[PDB]
């Protein structure tokens, strides 16, 4: 009820997580399949707060929040092991969910002339999408994406295949 009147947004981003997770048998009957993941963005108000709502209404299996900056580190190759091993964890956690904020920091696309530059950023994000493009599971763990700006296009052209349900704010009625 802390939502500010946004309904179609909260309805879609709700049925995309609760309904498949609360009543899995429903889709298995009608299957078809529910989408892999979602996307949120727009002006700051209100980002990341509807995420807190997903925390509240969250019933059983825990979900893992992931801030954007902890991916990028110096001494390259660290955030890669990171994202990989947290995916292995989520594959241990049986139907647990992941959320990403500030993805626009780590998904900067595409490149520059040189010398880079994006090369660590690229290998981390493209590595993320690489983990996303393996056939298994993937992931039965959903995902969640909330940011400010919709750019950049490389993760945004890699999402619509796996991910879906891009919804925009709205903003005060």
């Amino acid at each position: 009820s802390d939502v500010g009147g946004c309904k179609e947004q909260i309805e879609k981003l709700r049925e995309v997580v609760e309904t498949p997770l609360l009543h899995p048998e429903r889709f298995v009957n009608l299957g078809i399949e529910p989408p892999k993941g979602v996307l949120l963005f727009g002006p700051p108000g209100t980002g990341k707060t509807l995420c807190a709502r997903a925390v509240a209404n969250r019933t059983d299996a825990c979900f893992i929040r992931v801030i954007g900056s902890e991916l990028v580190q110096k001494y390259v190759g660290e955030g890669a092991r990171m994202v990989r091993e947290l995916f292995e964890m989520a594959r241990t956690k049986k139907a647990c969910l992941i959320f990403f904020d500030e993805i626009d920091a780590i998904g900067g696309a595409r490149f520059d002339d040189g010398a880079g530059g994006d090369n660590e950023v690229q290998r981390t994000m493209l590595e993320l999408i690489n983990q996303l493009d393996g056939f298994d599971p993937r992931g039965n763990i959903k995902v969640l994406m909330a940011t400010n700006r919709p750019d950049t296009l490389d993760p945004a052209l890699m999402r619509p295949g796996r991910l879906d349900r891009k919804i925009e704010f709205s903003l005060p009625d």
Binding site: E15, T19, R26, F27, L30, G31, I32, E33, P34, P35, Y75, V76, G77, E78, A80, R81, R110, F111, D113, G114, A115, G116, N119, E120, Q122, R123, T124, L126, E127, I129, N130, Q131, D133, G134, F135, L157, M158, P160, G161, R162, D164, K166, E168
Partner: protein, 292 residues
């Protein structure tokens, strides 16, 4: 050599044991098979004829080569914006090969210490040469295949250095003639320009946007399992597919099931199809005005 088995203070070796190493590097991927096959995709019959050529002709038809004196292809470049869906292509037909198959992720070769990826790739091609014939598939080569320009510094200079070491395994040493290795890249923007060769990247195929025939075909393959009310044009929405990726046709099906739920209708309808089309593409919103 190494690994020779010796017991503590004995400093004598009872048995010489193989083979090699190591954990994640030893087994990056051991694939049983993915269930999908080439029959699940459509519109690629020409380029999948080129693929099925490059992979299948060394397996069964090697005798034909030795009759004609033919050098088979090795590197085969795979590029296009998703989708396409070239990963289901390569891994589907990889499950149709029955030969040994190893998946691999491009950025995996980026490592913590200097040139770990080198011994990594050498171990990979060593177990590949052991399992010969075999197939190794890598993606996002352009992530590790950006040579940059000039010092300093390329943090991947060791990784791309290992790529040039793959060009040495394709250059100064012939034995890679067995176990064809396939590569895929979403964007051909940055490359090692030396990657052009038959042992290196040879058959190079652009994967375009699917065509309305192929779009309605493959989307019909995604919806063929689900209950559909037997009124669908596939022509109407095939033309309503503009700039779509086949993956966004999948999203059209997935959304068809989504609002098919909230409708309460037990079976899918065409208004649902065009609905989901409008849903995923193109975006939103503004308002209806000024155009009357």
């Amino acid at each position: 050599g190494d690994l020779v088995g010796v017991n503590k203070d004995s400093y004598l070796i009872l048995e010489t044991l193989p083979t090699e190493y190591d954990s994640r590097v030893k087994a990056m991927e051991v694939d049983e098979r993915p269930t999908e096959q080439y029959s699940d995709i459509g519109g690629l019959d020409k380029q999948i004829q080129e693929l099925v050529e490059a992979i299948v002709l060394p397996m069964n038809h090697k005798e034909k080569f030795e009759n004609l004196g033919i050098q088979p292809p090795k590197g085969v470049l795979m590029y296009g914006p998703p989708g396409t869906g070239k990963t289901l292509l390569a891994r589907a037909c990889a499950a149709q090969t029955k030969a040994t198959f190893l998946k691999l992720a491009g950025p995996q070769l980026v490592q913590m210490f200097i040139g770990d990826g080198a011994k990594l790739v050498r171990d990979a091609f060593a177990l590949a040469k052991e399992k010969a014939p075999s197939i190794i598939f890598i993606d996002e080569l352009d992530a590790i295949g950006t040579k940059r320009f000039d010092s300093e510094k390329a943090g991947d200079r060791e990784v791309q250095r290992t790529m040039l070491e793959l060009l040495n395994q394709l250059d100064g040493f012939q034995p890679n003639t067995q176990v064809k290795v396939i590569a895929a890249t979403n964007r051909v923007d940055i490359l090692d320009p030396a990657l052009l060769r038959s042992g290196r990247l040879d058959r190079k195929i652009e994967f375009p946007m699917p065509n309305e025939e192929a779009r309605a075909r493959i989307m019909q393959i995604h919806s063929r399992k689900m209950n559909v009310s037997p009124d669908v044009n596939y022509e109407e929405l095939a033309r309503c597919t503009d700039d779509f990726n086949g993956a966004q046709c999948k999203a059209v099906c997935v959304e068809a099931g989504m609002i098919a739920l909230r409708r309460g209708a037990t079976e899918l309808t065409h208004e649902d199809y065009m609905e989901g089309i409008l849903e995923v593409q193109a975006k939103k919103k503004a308002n209806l005005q000024y155009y009357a």
